[PDB]
């Protein structure tokens, strides 16, 4: 509670395992070169779900490091950023399980009540953003993404002109916002792929990050399964975005593929 | 005010809260044209909706009529969902409410709920060769598309007071194709 | 090159032809793109949109102008300094 | 047969529609700024699957343009490159169908006996390479992919270093080879993503395209569903690739995710 923890290159600021319960309310945890949180390394296997080790950063907690969370990869984890907590890290895992085959518990993270994770991941099993924000800094994988009460994923604007990012998700559900970058006469954009199942009302805000276009060309923003039940709407003022002498609107057709059409702007 | 009902024979063409006629729930067969009074047409072809409007001394809108009747609706928006089966109510899984699509003149579901067939021809032609596709009442040749207006529940950005599709032949039938009646204004 | 009255009709229609094209109320001829296009002043999109007819010819029209001059090219979205309009309506006998 | 066909920017070398049957053997078709082949524009709609309009480029045919095939939407097409024919273009559809919510048939291409399409697509419904090669020139989307008898999908080597390409597929079947680009110093690589279903024995051949890595670092190569039936094997001889003073091998980890692991090369 309102404490400071500084870790050097080799280590981590917090290691929890064997079913621990950590809360960090307020204060700061830095780990410049290493991890902010590490999980496992001293195994104790159990058939029913014990206290699937949970870490909670709340009430204004600041956390910075190369990775925000580093999973060993025997144990299931449960990271939670709440109450305006802010962590810039990465969330990585071991990338080969110790026993090839038969399961491996979930790595679950909840972003809630005004919190803000800013990083990249291809390791999280299930993310739930709820009136909070994930600033996505690089291409990412997530199993099950859920949004609620104005939760957003905010594709971070590249300082590298022209370079787009892709967020792949296995299942989408609920209702949230997705701020996405678009590059006009290069005709490229941040994409969002849902692979098995999509549902709910979502919104897409569009940032003009590549300067205005020579022509009028469409841009794929969202790809979803064939007979999908999910809906998306352009969140910019009036359901349109003006890029130079052009105007764009979100239109989807056929098979949950939500492009962004545009043609000459009203004189 | 409302899109054509299936029971237009007993209700009139324009009634609140009734099943909307489409390719599936096709309108009752006009009694003025050999309809028995409970039988329905086998599809939702232009021919059929045009027949029904005549029976009530009305016609399908032209472009200039449509762009006018539907002004005031929310442009470039659609009902969403998987269906709009009923006049004046929200659609099956509608992502926006019916009254968002209400004209300056109180035309209910003006746009983006169901394409209305029109009374103008042009656009994409059919086979430049005789085709007997007219419910067995003669053959067409180089038959141009019969206009469709407004957009339906599932063309999100495409829909609106000037939305227009000139692809469908008049013999086409789909569940996004209904009709809205118009007629002259007489002052005496 | 020729004075305005040259273009008065039998019915007293002034500048009846050969001055400005008039938009007609009829669709046909050259189609626009075979793909939805949002060129309707922001009131929806149009697929395979046929031209709105224009009648009469214009000052530049040379010997093509006249009472049956008709151009089925311009879509409803087009706009030029020689495209105008003339109103017509029904005749009411009571 | 052995004919030559040139077309201006505003046009196409061939337009076929309404159940047309076109065979091009030998010869040449160019369309420097247009399409080589266009499909549709003259509606004739019948529920029976008549002779779904088909084009075949065989017996060493040459074909070049801004796109190899442009589909007018809402007619089904069957493009076939065989007998060592070579076409470079792009294959595009219209994005929006004319009638939102109705049946559209498939855009099916079949690369066979020694043929070679070089281009990119997000319009092809079902591509089948068989003793042929698709040189993929940019990010792409295909519904059902199917390979056989040394059918390959050669990811083209980028001129821009660091620029990786991604192929997304709905379903994968049969047995083929994938040439892929690797940028070891950056820890980045071409990816192959299968979203619904994967199966069969496939081979990956790695190309070094960003030499001299600081450390040994894993690089994701293939993504497949749940517990997919698909096997992959690294086709570089001895099942390894030596990038500077480092050796990489392919390992499948957890839920069908084939990464390229590697560490310091044996002395
Ligand atoms: Mg007319
Ligand atoms: Mg006409």
Polypeptide structure, described:
- The structure is cut from a larger assembly and holds 2 copies of chain A (267 residues) and 2 copies of chain B.
- Chain A is an all-beta fold and 267 residues long.
- In chain A, strands 1, 2, 4, 6, 7, 9, 10, 12, 14, 16, 18, 19, 21 and 23 form a 14-stranded mixed sheet that branches.
- In chain A, a hairpin with a 3-residue loop joins β24 and β25.
- Chain A is elongated.
- The N and C termini of chain A lie far apart (59 Å).
- With 188 residues, chain B is mostly loops.
- Chain B has one domain: paralog of FGE (formylglycine-generating enzyme) (Alpha-Beta Complex), CATH 3.90.1580.
- Helix content of chain B is 11%, strand content 8%.
- Chain B starts with 7 loop residues before the first helix and ends in a 10-residue tail after the last strand.
- Chains B and C meet through α3 and β3 of B and β1 and β2 of C.
- The PDB classes it as viral protein/membrane protein.
- Keywords: Prn, pertactin.
- The entry is titled "Major Tropism Determinant P1 (Mtd-P1) Variant Complexed with Bordetella brochiseptica Virulence Factor Pertactin extracellular domain (Prn-E)".
- Chains A, D: Pertactin Extracellular Domain.
- The organism of A, D is Bordetella bronchiseptica.
